[PDB]
């Protein structure tokens, strides 16, 4: 069994790796232990060549070397590695691994988001608010949790960007699950937005995972913005 955040972060990681036909992550407890996929991820999201590393790290010393290379790169970019060391990754500390991946999502997916001079999380929230301004009172984006669980904010974002793809006014606003599914399907099929979260992970969830939602909503910002150039 894997948590929403585990699954969402794994899917995010894989969208990056697949951009270079690299092998996927299936289990974050085990699949980062030799340091290779972490290094490759960093090259991809960081747009840099990290140079040579151990490509057959059969011995523990070489896995630690690989992971240490990754962590040093992350530190060199000014990201906090609060209370994580190479052995935490080699030995599959899932809590610390998810923490690290969030640090990377925040830096490489969210930090550069900008709306009205606000950046990062604030910027992304404000973008959502501005883009859904015409959908009050039923849509009211106030956070990256409860504001998203009825499906309508996702549908409104799609509709305002491409009113030909999703007829918002024809939705049965009470069918949260059908509307969520519709948005996720249209986003993926027509807008190229990867399905980082399952409908059941957010639809009518009392305490949805904030970081997972943020990770997925950031895909809307980047795709919409790029497509609107
Ligand atoms: Zn747009
Ligand atoms: Zn509650
Ligand atoms: Zn969270």
Residue numbers in the entry: 6 to 234
From the study:
The structure of S. pombe ABD consists of two calponin homology domains with similar folds, CH1 (residues 6–119) and CH2 (residues 120–234). Each domain consists of four long helices A1, C1, E1, G1 and A2, C2, E2 and G2 respectively. Indeed, the overall fold of S. pombe α-actinin ABD is very similar to other actin-binding domains. The structure was solved in the closed conformation where the interactions between the CH1 and CH2 domains are mainly caused by helices A1 and G1 (CH1 domain) and helix G2 and the coiled region between helices E2 and G2 (CH2 domain). The hydrogen bonding pattern between CH1 and CH2 is very much conserved when comparing S. pombe ABD with other ABDs. Further, there is a π-cation interaction between two residues from G1 and G2. In the S. pombe protein this interaction occurs between the conserved Trp107 and Arg216. In addition, there is a salt bridge present between helix A1 in CH1 and the loop between E2 and G2 in CH2 in the S. pombe protein; a strong bidentate hydrogen bond interaction between Arg12 and Asp206 (hydrogen bond distances: 2.9 and 3.1 Å, respectively). Taken together, the strength of the π-cation bond between Trp107 and Arg216 and the interaction between Arg12 and Asp206 indicate strong interactions between CH1 and CH2 and may favor a closed conformation of the actin-binding domain. Three metal ions are found in the crystal structure and they are modelled as zinc due to the high concentration of zinc in the crystallization conditions.
